[PDB]
Write a protein that binds this ligand. Structure first.
Ligand code: KAI
Ligand code: KAI
Ligand code: CL
Ligand code: CL
Ligand code: CL
Ligand code: CL
Ligand code: NH4
Ligand code: NH4
Lengths: 254, 254
């Protein structure tokens, strides 16, 4: 039987394909994660239906501690796999079973080119430049939970004024960096994609932490360890590197 | 419960402590992996007994498909955990379980500063500068199995002439780089440790691949998932970063 795969639109992982006619089914989509799912299905021999997560969220807890997003789909057995840039975090790994990482990344800073700002510390010790993150994503959660001095300071700033420095999604954050005096705390793999495409933006500093994206499965899933092995195969054969180059390469920026 | 932990001496992961008198039991050792044990044991509650792997190997297969080293200890249920720089690989994942990674690295090149060599391709396209890897380690296995043309070329060279370009262990490789015209293919975290301590040596190029070290367990072990959760906790709190900095930082280079 066919596996149900929950996912979410996010460039260049999952995108609607361009066509002159309405699209249906898996043919609606392309991107890094679709290529990954193709290669996993060729190794393991499953068929799959891709289904966008109905609430359009990744996965976080409400005040009752109930989950939402892709994470909740897995928990409730409404999906067999989640294939998306879903960050492997302590809070999520308690409730679902992630494969080992297919991509390795960290939080970093997206900002304008040409400025004296060089680090998170540089941001934290001032108030003129605004800075934030996507609300309720793993980056925000990192700042909220940190007991490291600099990151707390930054959290105090981000959460101030009813979280006015936060944004609902990455595209809103990018447009805010492009238009106003604002820096976005963003996952490094997304910064790499953005800066290959808008030449006035750059990454500031290095990575603030280290983590991965993994395929999500419900706790107890027999597919988890099989997908880990298939990922390690694809990594060792250079295929994951090829897939990243295909989807990230931009040809217009210095 | 007291867990039995298999490990191997490897700087700065597991080292004999310095003392005026003979040392006994866990008190014989210090290093990044001993610190990681103390943190995992604090989180999860277990006691532990560290025992060096009797054959002094990590774990590779022979012709008959038989395993040795720490991997074979876990397969045979002679240890509960392997805590070491044990690379998470496709072949080992088929026979043991691993936690998610506590460190993320890739193969790169250790060579002398101030030469024209800038990449693996530079090494592959010539025969004058010798290059190789630790025999039967995961780096050697990477080259042996690769179908990427550059890496196939490299493997043909390393394996030529009775594997004269390979070395038995990392310290042998580092002495050969320091004395002769030789480059060592080495995991990037060990290169960082070496270059902090040998100011004439450097990493050449970037990482050739991406992989992690994980705690090994027998297949089916209930500790594997508990240790993963504990590692994610330590990562997000910045403790793994602090541990790396403690063991890696050297006295400075001119
Ligand atoms: C695109 C966003 C909302 C996702 C992607 N990975 C993170 C997650 O899985 O929580 C979120 C990004 C962030 O928090 O910077
Ligand atoms: C120190 C050595 C022999 C180990 C460490 N990790 C690799 C392993 O787990 O196979 C080996 C290194 C390498 O192959 O470059
Ligand atoms: Cl078409
Ligand atoms: Cl859908
Ligand atoms: Cl895992
Ligand atoms: Cl021992
Ligand atoms: N899990
Ligand atoms: N496994």
């Amino acid at each position: 039987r066919t596996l149900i795969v929950t996912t979410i639109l996010e460039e260049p992982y999952v995108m609607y394909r361009k066509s002159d006619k309405p699209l249906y089914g898996n043919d609606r989509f392309e991107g890094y994660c679709l290529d990954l799912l193709k290669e996993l299905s060729n190794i393991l021999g499953f068929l799959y239906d891709v289904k966008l997560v109905p609430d359009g969220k990744y996965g976080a807890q409400n005040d009752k501690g109930e989950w939402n997003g892709m994470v909740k789909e897995l928990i409730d057995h409404r999906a067999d796999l989640a294939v998306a840039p879903l960050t492997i975090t302590y809070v999520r790994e308690k409730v679902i079973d992630f494969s080992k990482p297919f991509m390795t990344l960290g939080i970093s800073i997206l900002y304008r080119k040409g400025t004296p700002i060089d680090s998170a510390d540089d941001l934290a010790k001032q108030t003129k430049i605004e800075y934030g993150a996507v609300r309720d994503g793993s980056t925000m959660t990192f700042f909220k939970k940190s007991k490291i001095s600099t990151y707390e300071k930054m959290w105090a700033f981000m959460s101030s004024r009813q979280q006015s420095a936060l944004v609902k999604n990455s595209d809103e954050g990018i447009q805010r960096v492009l238009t106003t005096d604002y820096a976005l705390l963003m996952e490094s793999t997304s910064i790499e994609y953005v800066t290959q495409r808008n030449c006035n933006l750059t990454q500031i500093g290095g990575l603030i932490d280290s983590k991965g994206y993994g395929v999500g499965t419900p706790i107890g899933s027999p597919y988890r360890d099989k997908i880990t092995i298939a990922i390690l195969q694809l990594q060792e054969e250079g295929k994951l590197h090829m897939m990243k180059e295909k989807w990230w390469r931009g040809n217009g920026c210095p």
